[PDB]
Amino acid sequence: PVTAAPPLRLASRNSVFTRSGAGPRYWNIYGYSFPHNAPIPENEWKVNIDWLAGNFADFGYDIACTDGWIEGSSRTTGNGYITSYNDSWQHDWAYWANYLAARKMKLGVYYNPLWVHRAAVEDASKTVLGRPDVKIADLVVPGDFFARDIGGNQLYWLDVTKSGAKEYVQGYVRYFKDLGVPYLRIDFLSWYEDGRDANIGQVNAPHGRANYELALSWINEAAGEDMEVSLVMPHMFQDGSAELANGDLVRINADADKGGWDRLSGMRQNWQDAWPNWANPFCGFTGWSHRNGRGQLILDGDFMRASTFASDEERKTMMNLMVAAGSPLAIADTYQQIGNNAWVYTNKEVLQLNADGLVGKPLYRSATPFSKDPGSRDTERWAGQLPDGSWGVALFNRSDTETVTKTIDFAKDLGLATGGNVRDLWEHRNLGMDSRATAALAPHASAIFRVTPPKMHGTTRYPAAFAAWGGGAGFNYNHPGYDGNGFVDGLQAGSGSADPLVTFAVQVPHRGSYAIRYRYANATGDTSTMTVTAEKADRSTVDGPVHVSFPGLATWDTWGVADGTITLDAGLNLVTIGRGATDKGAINLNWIELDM
Ligand SMILES: OC[C@H]1O[C@H](OC[C@H]2O[C@@H](O)[C@H](O)[C@@H](O)[C@@H]2O)[C@H](O)[C@@H](O)[C@@H]1O
Ligand SMILES: OC[C@H]1O[C@H](OC[C@H]2O[C@@H](O)[C@H](O)[C@@H](O)[C@@H]2O)[C@H](O)[C@@H](O)[C@@H]1O
């Protein structure tokens, strides 16, 4: 029988955004501003919005998002917050957020709330929201300009040790949130933190890790559950600990830039310790995939520039990758650039993967961090499970010259007992019941499938090696007997202040008590326990926390199945199993099953 338990110690922001599914669908001005190297004129912003309203908003791309080139946004409120995107604009943020509302859309904003504009500093009448004693001028160290060393002289970096700083930062984050912004894209924090860039040299004065982590905590608290926090230049120190604790999205690649295959799949394949750890998103998504999933981070592959690619097969591959990784789907094509490529973004079955909350992982091959061993995960084969137990499976051929067969076996790789019905989502074709998904792919081509296991008597298996991992839980395959490619270890007592855990998203037809099974190993020499909960996306408890018991077994190569019962509500539940301070021993976890 199960006993009551205290809650697990978390190390992630664990917001409704990361719990509820994949990244958002949006449009960004980068397609105009990057090639023009200039801020988007207000009229071009308007024409793009109107085009989105008529052509893509109906496919869920209902955020229009500003980007950089913000040095020329100098007008501020009485408390130093920018009133518009650029000083050339006739209308303020409120006007645009409502013009967007009139078209069933929302405003996305690119800004860093640690920027303090020079013009605000130079107007001594401006003061910190709620702190009339602190002039905006009192928030900065003279000379401490963003990008100082490369000519920057319009934006200061905030000195977070100055009185009024917290109120300034938090007021800036709520300023946008209150305006109706569901998405804040925060860039340049690595330049803030250590004043350097591996692709340039010194850029400005360093501010240090402690200040960086404090600033993030302020942003997190200020954004709350209402506004999604995208971190665009994360240094990802300590396996991304500060970013995981305080953000929803992290960029995992160098900028889209001129786009095309080389940005998507080239440049360099190796890891480096500096922003960006990996240059291309195939490597970046694969490399940071251990940090993805419900309640952890959403990985951000940046912007899709469809007409920068060389073929329609490349365009499909671009989209398939973002979808497979659970990334935001961010269109950067303007109304002038889209040409005949709208179809890339609006395949309903492919979009349905993102809607249902697909967050795939590359096929794990070993426990070694991908940063140390590129053989440890397969950048070209991806799979993830939807809450209802169906799957998204994606296969890629990154060869420039050879046609290559890729396969995911449902028993050997995914760890299922049942096979599944397979639908090719670009062919829009049912392939029937099968034991694998496979494609002979031309160079740069891909395939993506919905795989739907049959459910004899409702039984649904969720393999742990494709679930979400936190607090030191991770993949291994170093004791035989597991179903699939491996299992989850690190569910043991540890140094850190976070508890190791695995989270599964599960979808059930009705409220009730459900039979749950746990395939595990435990050769600690004694019974082990784990804390199990069910929760709503908003974190509300549906069941537990309770200690579940796992009988000791002869060896680590021995597997067994513990039985339990769990109360789940209709629809989406997050079932999280982990090792708290009060739990005993350790387990390795292969899968859970629910009879629904
Ligand atoms: O005004 C800020 C900044 O805008 C432009 O850069 C925007 C890009 O910055 C990268 O760091 C980021 O990864 C990309 O997603 C952004 O689009 C501009 O080029 C730069 O000079 C400005 O300072
Ligand atoms: O604690 C459960 C754990 O037990 C066994 O591993 C013991 C330790 O092995 C070390 O090499 C490793 O670095 C430590 O983290 C382990 O605690 C077992 O082999 C492993 O599979 C189990 O998870």
> Which CATH number covers residue 451?
2.60.40.1180
DSSP string, 413-477: II--SS-EEEEETTTTEEEEEESEEEEEEPTT-EEEEEEE---GGGEEEEEGGGSEEETT-EEE-
568 and 534 within one domain: yes
Q: Which residue has the tokens 């091959």?
A: 365
Tokens matching residue 415:
């760890």
Cα 478 from Cα 488, distance rounded (Å) = 10
Residue type, 256: A
**With contact defined as beta carbons under 8 Å apart, do 330 and 26 qualify?**
yes
**With contact defined as beta carbons under 8 Å apart, do 328 and 322 qualify?**
yes
Residue 588 CA, ligand 2 centroid: distance in Å: 9
Cα angle 128, 133, 134 (rounded to 5 degrees) comes to 45
Cα 469 from Cα 467, distance rounded (Å) = 7
Residue 294 CA, ligand 2 centroid: distance in Å: 26
Residue type, 288: W
Domain-located, residue 235? no
Tokens matching residue 326:
């659970």
**With contact defined as beta carbons under 8 Å apart, do 91 and 84 qualify?**
yes
Tokens matching residue 101:
């509302």
Residue type, 441: L
**With contact defined as beta carbons under 8 Å apart, do 69 and 39 qualify?**
yes
Give the gyration radius of the chain's Cα atoms: 24
Cα angle 579, 580, 581 (rounded to 5 degrees) comes to 130
586 and 518 within one domain: yes
Cα 158 from Cα 133, distance rounded (Å) = 17
**The domain boundary residue, chosen from 457, 482, 510:** 457
**With contact defined as beta carbons under 8 Å apart, do 362 and 285 qualify?**
yes
Cα 594 from Cα 596, distance rounded (Å) = 6
Number of domains in the chain: 2
Contacts of residue 514, Cβ cutoff 8 Å, sequence gap at least 6: 508, 565, 566, 567, 568, 594, 595, 596
Is the bond preceding residue 276 a cis peptide, omega within 30 degrees? Answer: yes
Q: Helix axis angle, 209-223 relative to 165-178, nearest 10°?
A: 40
518 and 437 within one domain: no
**With contact defined as beta carbons under 8 Å apart, do 289 and 382 qualify?**
no
Residue 118 CA, ligand 1 centroid: distance in Å: 18
465 and 591 within one domain: yes
Domain-located, residue 347? no
523 and 432 within one domain: no
472 and 405 within one domain: no
Query: How many angstroms separate the most distant Cα atoms in the chain?
Result: 74
Pocket around ligand 2: residues whose beta carbon is below 6 Å from it? 479, 489, 492, 556, 586, 588
CA distances from 179 to 115, 117, 131, 368 (A): 19, 20, 21, 45
Cα–chain center distance at 234: 13
Q: Report the CATH number that the domain containing residue 473 is assigned in CATH.
A: 2.60.120.260
C-beta of 255 in contact with ligand 1 (< 6 A): yes
User: Atom of ligand 2 at shortest distance to CA of 523?
Assistant: 4
Backbone φ, ψ for residue 489 (5° rounding): -115, -170
**With contact defined as beta carbons under 8 Å apart, do 589 and 518 qualify?**
yes
Q: How many helices (H) and strands (E) does the chain have?
A: 13, 34
Cα 587 from Cα 522, distance rounded (Å) = 5
Cα 41 from Cα 105, distance rounded (Å) = 20
Domain-located, residue 568? yes
Q: Is 307 helix (H, G, I), strand (E, B) or coil?
A: helix
Nearest to 462 by CA among 568, 584, 579: 568
Exposed e or buried b per residue across 138-159, where buried means at least 16 C-beta atoms within 10 angstroms of its C-beta: bbbeeebbbbbbeebebbbbbb
Residue 326 CA, ligand 1 centroid: distance in Å: 24
Residue 293 CA, ligand 2 centroid: distance in Å: 24
Half-sphere exposure of residue 243, counting CA atoms within 13 Å on the CB side?
28
Residues in the chain: 596
Cα 307 from Cα 552, distance rounded (Å) = 58
8-state DSSP, 511:
S
| Ligand having the closest approach to the CA of 479 | 2
Q: Helix axis angle, 93-101 relative to 42-55, nearest 10°?
A: 20
Cα 268 from Cα 266, distance rounded (Å) = 6
Give the bridge partners for 591, in sequence order: 463, 519
Tokens matching residue 253:
């690649």
| Ligand having the closest approach to the CA of 191 | 1
Tokens matching residue 452:
């739907």
**Secondary element (H or E) of residue 184:** strand 183-186
Cα 120 from Cα 226, distance rounded (Å) = 28
Tokens matching residue 283:
């490597």
Cα 235 from Cα 12, distance rounded (Å) = 17
495 and 463 within one domain: yes
Q: In what order do the strands lie in the sheet with 298-300?
A: 298-300, 249-251, 228-231, 183-186, 106-110, 63-65, 25-28, 329-331
Cα 350 from Cα 292, distance rounded (Å) = 20
**Secondary element (H or E) of residue 189:** helix 189-194
C-beta of 68 in contact with ligand 1 (< 6 A): yes
Domain-located, residue 445? yes
Structural domain span for residue 499 = 459-595
- Where would I find the H helices in 65-134? 93-101, 118-122
447 and 381 within one domain: yes
Contacts of residue 312, Cβ cutoff 8 Å, sequence gap at least 6: 344
Cα angle 390, 396, 400 (rounded to 5 degrees) comes to 175
Q: Helix axis angle, 312-325 relative to 348-355, nearest 10°?
A: 20
Strand pairing report for 391-396 and 446-452 = antiparallel
Best residue among 30, 69, 117 to mutate for probing ligand 1's pocket (most ligand atoms within 8 Å of CB) is 69
Nearest CA to ligand 2 atom 16: 490
Give the resolution in Å.
2.0
443 and 477 within one domain: no
Q: Is 546 helix (H, G, I), strand (E, B) or coil?
A: strand
CA distances from 582 to 494, 546, 547, 589 (A): 12, 11, 9, 19
Nearest to 384 by CA among 310, 315, 334, 327: 327
Domain-located, residue 248? no
8-state DSSP, 507:
E
**The domain boundary residue, chosen from 457, 486, 502:** 457
**The domain boundary residue, chosen from 439, 457, 475:** 457
Cα–chain center distance at 306: 21
**With contact defined as beta carbons under 8 Å apart, do 226 and 179 qualify?**
no
DSSP string, 239-255: HHHHHHHH-SEEE-SS-
Domain-located, residue 118? no
Nearest to 7 by CA among 491, 387, 498, 516: 498
483 and 442 within one domain: no
548 and 443 within one domain: no
Q: Which residues are catalytic?
A: 187, 248
Cα angle 250, 264, 402 (rounded to 5 degrees) comes to 140
Contacts of residue 132, Cβ cutoff 8 Å, sequence gap at least 6: none
Experimental approach: X-ray
Strand pairing report for 459-463 and 587-595 = antiparallel
**With contact defined as beta carbons under 8 Å apart, do 346 and 417 qualify?**
no
Domain-located, residue 171? no
473 and 440 within one domain: no
Residue type, 289: S
Cα 102 from Cα 105, distance rounded (Å) = 7
> Which runs of E-coded beta strand occur in 85-137?
106-110, 115-117, 127-128, 131-135
Helix, strand, coil distribution of the chain in percent, nearest 5: 25, 30, 45
